[PDB]
Design a protein around this ligand. Structure first.
Ligand code: QPC
Ligand code: CA
Ligand code: ZN
Length: 345
């Protein structure tokens, strides 16, 4: 085949992909069977299942050449922010897009942008935060004036690659579709900037306050402004979904992300950065930080998402609580959350 995947575990990959439409899909096994091409394998899976290749005349070869390229622009050596995360966000977005409240709502084009924005939203992530880049006066921080530095990068890179040889997956869209898709993708990726979370949520609460559904229970969004607000929150939720998965998978994400944060602390030390030293693996509590994050950021977000789509998200939300309660139970420089909240200034 094209993924070079072995006849050995082709049944495995096929059987794992049966839960492609489910929140409890295991992206980790999928990466195993794909030879570490989860982003490409899942995206291809997603696009077939929604028939996006056919609808937009995106040939298989074009899609795969682009997706392979894009996946290569993610750093497998960065602990959390590699192609596996990207793959997980796209699959999570794929699931959200099809909940009963939501499924009839979005146009094929809108569906295309959301899943694509998901795929690209972290491409070429260096392993460090926006603030780290700012404080080191990296070329990126200067290029984007210290505002949504990386998110501006992920977009630029995601669209740039469309120009490589046989990589233009949007080649057969009209001029109007390409600019509609582009405005939407831009919106959704910039939406992933965490310093935008609170204003994201504020607006979502509003969507909920005045939500109306059809006779069928389908949410009603009559202007571009509304459905792009749902979309951008959808992708931010998906971005923030780790703790809503089966505890065993949430544990694997947490190991990865903590590795990546503490590795940012090592880089800050190596470089004699600022002065203010972040707590390390020994002095920090990962358990406290999780519960702080779930209470301060994740749950307030998911609870609101659950209102918008009542009761589509209940099993998701019941798992979040369970998971919070489980990190809770394990609870015994400048800490994880002290750092995340300070540099939200
Ligand atoms: C500010 C920073 C923490 C140094 C770097 N972070 C960034 O550049 C943005 C960023 C990237 C990913 C996440 N996701 C997550 N962030 C946390 C977290 C917990 C306590 C304090 C801070 C963070 N926990 C879990 C996830 C999870 N499992 O999804 C949150 C923020
Ligand atoms: Ca990001
Ligand atoms: Zn992300």
């Amino acid at each position: 085949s094209r993924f070079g995947v072995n006849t050995e575990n082709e049944d495995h990959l096929a059987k794992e992909l049966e839960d492609l439409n489910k929140w409890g899909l295991n992206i980790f096994n999928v990466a195993g069977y794909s030879h570490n091409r989860p982003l490409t394998c899942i995206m291809y899976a997603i696009f077939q299942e929604r028939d996006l290749l056919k609808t937009f005349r995106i040939s298989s070869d074009t899609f795969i050449t682009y997706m392979m390229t894009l996946e290569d622009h993610y750093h497998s050596d960065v602990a959390y922010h590699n192609s596996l995360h990207a793959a997980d966000v796209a699959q999570s977005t794929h699931v959200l897009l099809s909940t009963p409240a939501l499924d009839a709502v979005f146009t094929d084009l809108e569906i295309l942008a959301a899943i694509f924005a998901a795929a690209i939203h972290d491409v070429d992530h260096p392993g460090v935060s926006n603030q780290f880049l700012i404080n080191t006066n990296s070329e990126l921080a200067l290029m984007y004036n210290d505002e949504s530095v990386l998110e501006n990068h992920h977009l630029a890179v995601g669209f740039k690659l469309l120009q490589e040889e046989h990589c233009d997956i949007f080649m057969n869209l009209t001029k109007k579709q390409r600019q509609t898709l582009r405005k939407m993708v831009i919106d959704m990726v910039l939406a992933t900037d965490m310093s935008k979370h609170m204003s994201l949520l504020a607006d979502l609460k509003t969507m909920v306050e005045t939500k109306k559904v059809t006779s069928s229970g389908v949410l009603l969004l009559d202007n571009y402004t509304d459905r792009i607000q749902v979309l951008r929150n959808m992708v931010h939720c998906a971005d923030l979904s780790n703790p809503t998965k089966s505890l065993e998978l949430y544990r694997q994400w947490t190991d990865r992300i903590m590795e990546e944060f503490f590795q940012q602390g090592d880089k800050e030390r190596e470089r004699g950065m600022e002065i203010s030293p972040m707590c390390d693996k020994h002095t920090a509590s990962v358990e406290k930080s999780q519960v702080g994050f779930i209470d301060y950021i994740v749950h307030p977000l998911w609870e609101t998402w659950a209102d918008l789509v009542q009761p589509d998200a209940q099993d998701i939300l019941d798992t979040l609580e369970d998971n919070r309660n489980w990190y809770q139970s394990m609870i015994p420089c400048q800490g994880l959350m002290e750092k995340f909240q300070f540099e939200l200034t």
